[PDB]
Design a protein around this ligand. Structure first.
Ligand SMILES: CNC(=O)c1c(NC(=O)c2nc(C3CC3)ccc2Nc2cncnc2)cnn1CCOC
Ligand SMILES: [Mg+2]
Ligand SMILES: [Zn+2]
Length: 316
């Protein structure tokens, strides 16, 4: 009952509070870690533990054995959201605490390792069904499916209209992880913040901020200790290159990040990605949520590490 608290070994208990925490190589431990994060950020009364565990294991089952967009990534993204929530606890509603961890867990459901562009060029049926944010609408669709399985409705105690709000929080959160949308969203939040217009009681403003939190959480692999960030970059390029292979099989030249014949220009590509995407992302998020500072700091640190790789002072 509410007398049963989830607990972590001492190192995990302490370090899970750090933005740069790595959830480790033991898959069996990740459901325990997520439940722990839900109990401490939401509460032990937020979800029926039996439903949550059933919902978690179905979500895990619907993640694929791909190098990067996998179950480890879902929990990692949830953990980053947990860290943002714990250090900005005053700024979020009950529905947002409930819904955002779950959105992070579900945000890449049934990812096969291929971008929205590959599905468009392949003419995947999902591209007829969802003309933009294709994968992201599929991720949400899969979330809803899993909620509608017997014994899986973790939101069963909520009123009809709360359930609808929480699903709309989840839907918009998952859609926000379409990076094609992030550039617009970050520009808008940037202008809004500088002008002083930004207003966390304005729902459409809340939506934008949660969307940037999701971008930041989604990319949070660039905010880990260097060994984690460097090893995780191998996994994403494994997917990028498999997709470039598939682009080439369609007789289409892939963009450079997905061409494995450009493996030697990964440090250059990363430098490009941090300056254009990551740094601006965590910068804007740090302005809006000052206590998310360590994400930006660890991002600048890993940039300086890539610079070191370029100049031959570091290996990868
Ligand atoms: C839009 N750009 C690019 O998506 C892009 C790159 N994307 C990533 O590296 C990357 N993308 C995602 C999301 C977009 C798919 C997440 C993590 C990434 N990296 C990473 C590094 N370390 C550890 N885990 C992950 C690389 N080159 N470009 C082109 C150059 O862009 C400026
Ligand atoms: Mg995704
Ligand atoms: Zn993701």
């Amino acid at each position: 009952q509410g007398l049963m608290q989830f607990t972590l070994p001492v190192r995990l208990c302490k370090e899970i509070e750090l933005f740069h925490f790595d959830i480790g190589p033991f898959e069996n431990m990740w459901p325990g870690i997520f439940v722990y994060m839900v109990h401490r950020s939401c509460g032990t009364s937020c979800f029926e533990l039996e439903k949550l565990c059933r919902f978690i294991m179905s979500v895990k089952k619907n993640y694929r054995r791909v190098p990067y967009h996998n179950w480890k990534h879902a929990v990692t993204v949830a953990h980053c959201m947990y860290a943002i929530l714990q250090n900005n606890h005053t700024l979020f509603t009950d529905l947002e605490r409930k819904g955002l961890l779950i959105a992070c867990l579900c945000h890449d459901l049934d990812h096969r390792g291929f971008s929205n562009s590959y599905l468009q060029k392949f003419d995947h049926p999902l591209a007829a069904l969802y003309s933009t944010s294709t994968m992201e609408q599929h991720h949400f669709s899969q979330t809803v499916s899993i909620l509608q399985l017997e014994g899986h409705n973790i939101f069963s105690t909520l009123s009809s209209s709360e359930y609808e709000q929480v699903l709309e929080i989840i839907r918009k959160a998952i859609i926000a992880t379409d990076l094609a949308l992030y550039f617009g969203n970050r520009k808008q939040l940037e202008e809004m913040y500088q002008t002083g217009s930004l207003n966390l009681n304005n729902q459409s403003h809340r939506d934008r901020v949660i969307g940037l939190m999701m971008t930041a959480c989604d990319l949070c692999s660039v905010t880990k200790l260097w060994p984690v960030t460097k090893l995780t970059a191998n996994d994403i390029y494994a997917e990028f290159w498999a997709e470039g292979d598939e682009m080439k099989k369609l007789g289409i030249q892939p963009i450079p990040m997905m061409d494995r014949d450009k493996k030697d220009e990964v440090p250059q590509g990363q430098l490009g990605f941090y300056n254009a995407v990551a740094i601006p992302c965590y910068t804007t998020l740090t302005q809006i949520l000052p206590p998310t500072e360590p994400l930006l700091k660890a991002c600048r640190d890993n940039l300086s590490q890539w610079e070191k790789v370029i100049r031959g002072e570091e290996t990868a």
